[PDB]
């Protein structure tokens, strides 16, 4: 089967770290930025990595059991199936927002009542000893004075980390999945700046909450979720060091820039000096597969 | 080109339990028939022709689905709708902005926040409630009405429905997610609504994909939201735009462990699936959720399906 990418304009595609439209295409503010996102990680032959779900249905949700009067949520998969401890960093689709506090909204499932607001607010710190999703649990900040059961929900908004006090949100980072005595197993590996004139391309969407900059919380990811779903369904073999893509204006059919999609599931371009890069481009473009190329193929600056 | 006009029809090759509801972003949790065999549906989301033509308020992807955005003035009750990206909603063109919720016969309990963030402290989340059968619910005209006066700063707000409850009026009536809200008004009907989908008859019945949505109901059971197509099907069709080459696409719902066919279904060009229930009580709800629908062949609308399930 021949390799393709979705024929849908970028602005209509979705972030792979939480379900939202892509609102920008950027380079990392720090050129030396290494990333290790656990969601939005997929080899271009359809091999999912980290905690990455095949589809958005599973993405950015948390599910587990909690006892009345406890602080600990014992995680399951989003569909309610048991989470295998020591095996994965966290359940499939578990949020990977590091360096922030999580303000979550959850509810007991399934509904078994005829009245009442089922929604509960809980907060989670991601750098505390109780944050151990790799061991199957996370700890809420307060005692959970609500009925025992199976709860499901998501992060509604984020804020500056509680510790160290004063530090800002940094969504380029992931939380600490492991424990003080055990590292998280099967983490999707880090992605390093490619060098040689190339730079990693990130897709960004805004997420609710304050920060020290009084500005939007921007969530960078490596691939649109629809690309991941496509790769999982298509399972097209990788036949070069990179897939050459053209970013095309669908209205005129003009090529707006060349990109390389690497087998590891990330995109690069060559910025044409400072001030240049994919952030200069309109967001209504469609990426089109042109050809398999070697890693030594020299990209035209964008 | 020749390639585009000769592009072969396909469906996403992913187990059903891994696919998403097209009325709100969530995993599909079951397949059902409508409780009423005569049930007509007119969902505005999850509507797409199998050659990729979107209908109603249906978004191409999940990123835009089940979101509400608009401007509200401090001290007012009126949310003036925009598209999810903040661009003006061209009213009279559509029943509502793309991705706008289509949950009828219930009260909406929403959570919204001012966008973009311009704050360095505090909780930005605001709770509002919306009734869908009141005079102020006029999304087609460009606005919906909150139940209480909005005593928060004027501006641009984005959010979603967090949970639903029984409709306020008529008192005592239950949630009915088989229905859509009234998008129009008394002096103006909603233009360009996705059309109704009628039961096929002649042994066939419509297949619905369900996912539970938070909130109570009169039956003390989950609020199951039925939709016609997984969202991934919609995205696939929009991307592929494969020409429709027959009256219907014959699908087999195949067990990925044994490669055996668990049931025959017809996917009609209007963007919905049917099966033949194997007697009273039988249906696709009896099948495991880990099956994969595979395209077998184009067939005529008169093609008869092997009955599915057991009475
Ligand atoms: C636990 C909590 O709610 N902390 C609040 C804090 O609350 C109180 C409570 C009682 C007293 N008192 O006895 O006098 C004083 C303060 O109030 C501050 C100031 O409003 C909150 O911090 C601010 O808002 C949050 C959302 C952040 O944006 C923060 O930077 C602001 O200064 C504080 O909220 C906590 O802040 C910490 C970081 O300091 C984390 O972000 C927590 O998630 C957040 O709950
Ligand atoms: C305005 C308000 O807060 N009313 C309270 C009721 O909630 C409303 O119920 C109506 C249905 O009558 C409708 O669902 C609205 O959306 C609710 O705001 C509340 O009713 C109870 O809880 C509801 C969520 C619903 O499940 C209903 O069946 C149930 O009776 C009553 C009782 O707690 O208090 C009212 O003040
Ligand atoms: Na940890
Ligand atoms: Na109305």
Enumerate how many helices of chain A there are, as a single number.
1
CATH fold type of the largest domain in chain A: Nucleoplasmin-like/VP (viral coat and capsid proteins)
Structural class of chain A: mainly beta
Strand content of chain A: 25-35%
Q: Which small molecules are bound?
A: a molecule of 4 linked components (NAG-GAL-FUC-NPO), a molecule of 3 linked components (NAG-GAL-FUC), sodium ion
What is the CATH level 1 assignment of the largest domain in chain A?
A: Mainly Beta
Q: What's the CATH architecture name of the largest domain in chain A? A: Beta Barrel
> Globular, elongated, flat, extended or rod-shaped: what is the shape of chain A?
elongated
Structure description:
2 copies of one chain form a homodimer. Chain A has one helix at 225-234; strands spanning 24-26, 42-43, 47-48, 62-66, 72-76, 101-108, 119-125, 137-139, 149-159, 199-200, 202-207, 217-221, 242-248, 255-262, 266-269, 286-293. By secondary structure, the first copy, chain A, is mainly beta. Chain A has 2 domains: 1-58 and 160-302, Positive stranded ssRNA viruses (Nucleoplasmin-like/VP (viral coat and capsid proteins)); 59-159, Elongation Factor Tu (Ef-tu), domain 3 (Beta Barrel), CATH 2.40.30. In chain A, the strands form 4 sheets. Chain A has a 6-stranded antiparallel sheet with strand order 7-6-9-4-5-8, with no helix packed on it. In chain A, strands 10-15-14-13-16 form a 5-stranded antiparallel sheet, with no helix packed on it. In chain A, a hairpin with a 5-residue loop joins strand 4 and strand 5. The radius of gyration of chain A is 20 Å and the shape is elongated. At the A-B interface, strand 6 and helix 1 of A face strand 4, strand 7 and helix 2 of B. One sodium ion (NA) binds at residues 137-138, 182, 184-185 of chain B. Chain A: This is Capsid protein. Chain A: Keywords: Host cytoplasm, Virion. Chain A: It is found in: Host cytoplasm; Virion.
